[PDB]
């Protein structure tokens, strides 16, 4: 999966991430950049404009939970399918989220990391993170395949 | 289909690239090659090491094509016709690869132009890059 120098770079950058706040930003951006994903969140209230989405408190709160699970994935990189077994059932068997959306959310998070870290988010650092978000998306889609 | 607001957002954001076209294009390619190694099969004769002159030269060509597309955002199929045959007919590039390069381009713009990468502009850039990809395939 991740080379020693990739695991070390991933953990280093993650120590600088406010997991709470990064989650709201990435989930908000997902809903703004790919508006069909808002359909899965009808109950979250007003998502009618980018400003409404980015100010929505249910988005902010649910983002914290999403990013908490990503953080949990980083501590179990060799058994992501097992760590995400419940979330997979929920997203695949109950919510029927098309798995391409898992890829989109992982890539939006990568965009947020590049946004805030700039030059520090180097091509090799991004590459390690692409392996992580691909593992997470695959573990989330596991009940599909 | 781009909205009027999308076109304004893309013109404003991409216009900040300016003289950095080559650097940003080369960086987006290097990001793609490292993050998605399968994309390297389309450049079998390239030196793909960091800072390679071949990647620099090609990165400039890609960024310069996007500047042209931005200038012709109302008639991109016409402005990108030669590029469409190159990628779709000659090169036979699998469409999934355009999503990878487009993503790596957003990453590069976010890292270099933080003030420009608001959620709404992010969204417009993504739609613009997808529209360019649709044409080239």
């Amino acid at each position: 999966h991740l080379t020693p120098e990739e695991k070390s770079a991933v953990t280093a950058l993650w120590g600088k991430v406010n997991v709470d706040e990064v989650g709201g930003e990435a989930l908000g951006r997902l809903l703004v950049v790919y508006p069909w994903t808002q359909r899965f969140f009808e109950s979250f209230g007003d998502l009618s404009t980018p400003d409404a989405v980015m100010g929505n408190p249910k988005v902010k709160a649910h983002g914290k939970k999403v990013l908490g699970a990503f953080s949990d994935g980083l501590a179990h990189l060799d058994n992501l399918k097992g760590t995400f077994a419940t979330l997979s059932e929920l997203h695949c068997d109950k919510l029927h989220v098309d798995p391409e959306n898992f890829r989109l959310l992982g890539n939006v998070l990568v965009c947020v990391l590049a946004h805030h870290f700039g030059k520090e988010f180097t091509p090799p650092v991004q590459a390690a993170y692409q392996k992580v978000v691909a593992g997470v998306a695959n573990a989330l889609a596991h009940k599909y395949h | 289909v781009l909205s009027p607001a999308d076109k304004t957002n893309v013109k404003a954001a991409w216009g900040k690239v300016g003289a950095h076209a080559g650097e940003y294009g080369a960086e987006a390619l290097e990001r793609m090659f490292l993050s998605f190694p399968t994309t390297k099969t389309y450049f079998p004769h390239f030196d793909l090491s960091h800072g390679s002159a071949q990647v620099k030269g090609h990165g400039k060509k890609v960024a310069d094509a996007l500047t042209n597309a931005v200038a012709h955002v109302d008639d991109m199929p016409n402005a990108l016709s030669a590029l469409s045959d190159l990628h779709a007919h000659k090169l036979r590039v699998d469409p999934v690869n355009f999503k990878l390069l487009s993503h790596c381009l957003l990453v590069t713009l976010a890292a270099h132009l933080p003030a420009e990468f608001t959620p709404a502009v992010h969204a417009s850039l993504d739609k613009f890059l997808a529209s360019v990809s649709t044409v080239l395939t």
């Epitope: 600088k16 406010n18 706040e21 870290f117 700039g118 | 890292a111």
Partner: nanobody, 126 residues
């Protein structure tokens, strides 16, 4: 009209003690400014303490304060907080709040800041 960065909290503490600073920001779109904390001891150069990128999404701590100080933001109150624990005599200084528009994480320690507060005295002593 004017941009204000008001520091509060702080005062006197014993070594080992704790203190919470706050910086209330006004006059700019808070969601777009990276908020930072610097400090300056009498006769000495000003020096980075801790900062976060806009919205508080990412953090950057001087190695001497990491794990020891914690920075936080309250986007609803346009306020940033610096919780200082395990204070030592070397922590006595004037602490400055600072704001920089869209300043990314690595540049927080040096990156030019746009707005500076007045600073508030923090005194650690026995």
């Amino acid at each position: 009209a004017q941009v204000q960065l008001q520091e509060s909290g702080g005062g006197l503490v014993q070594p080992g003690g704790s203190l919470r600073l706050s910086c209330a920001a006004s006059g700019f779109i808070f969601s777009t400014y990276s908020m930072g904390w610097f400090r300056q001891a009498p006769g000495k150069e000003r020096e980075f303490v801790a900062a976060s990128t806009w919205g508080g999404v990412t953090t950057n701590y001087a190695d001497s304060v990491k794990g020891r100080f914690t920075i936080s933001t309250d986007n609803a109150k346009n306020t940033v907080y610096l919780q200082m624990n395990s204070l030592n005599s070397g922590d006595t200084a004037v602490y400055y709040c600072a704001a920089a528009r869209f300043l990314q994480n690595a540049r927080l320690t040096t990156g030019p800041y746009d707005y500076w507060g007045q600073g508030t005295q923090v005194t650690v002593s026995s």
